[PDB]
């Protein structure tokens, strides 16, 4: 996600993660979030489970 320039919306890139631990606070500290909309989940549950 950080090595190269991001693609366009019609050419979206996909990352799938399995059997790993990721530093969510470090990921979120690099972005100024302006709007979010979750479905059948909450961001606190994503950070807690």
């Amino acid at each position: 996600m950080f090595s190269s320039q991001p693609p366009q919306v019609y050419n979206f890139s996909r990352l799938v993660f399995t059997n790993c631990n990721y530093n969510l606070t470090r990921l979120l500290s690099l972005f100024q979030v302006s709007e979010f909309s979750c479905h059948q989940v909450s961001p606190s549950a994503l950070a807690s489970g």
């Binding site: 979120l28 979030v33 979010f36």
Partner: protein
């Protein structure tokens, strides 16, 4: 009319409005202010 009215007010930038919304996991909801939903409540963001 209603029995009691409680107002919590603070200086807050409008660029971080998504951090005050329910369910958020940012620094504001984790270490600064978590909104209590026990009573009928409303959150207002405004400018002076």
């Amino acid at each position: 009319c209603y029995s009691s009215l409680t107002v919590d007010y603070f200086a807050y930038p409008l660029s971080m409005a998504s951090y005050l919304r329910q369910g958020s996991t940012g620094p504001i909801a984790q270490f600064n202010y978590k909104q209590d939903f026990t009573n009928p409540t409303c959150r207002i963001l405004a400018a002076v």
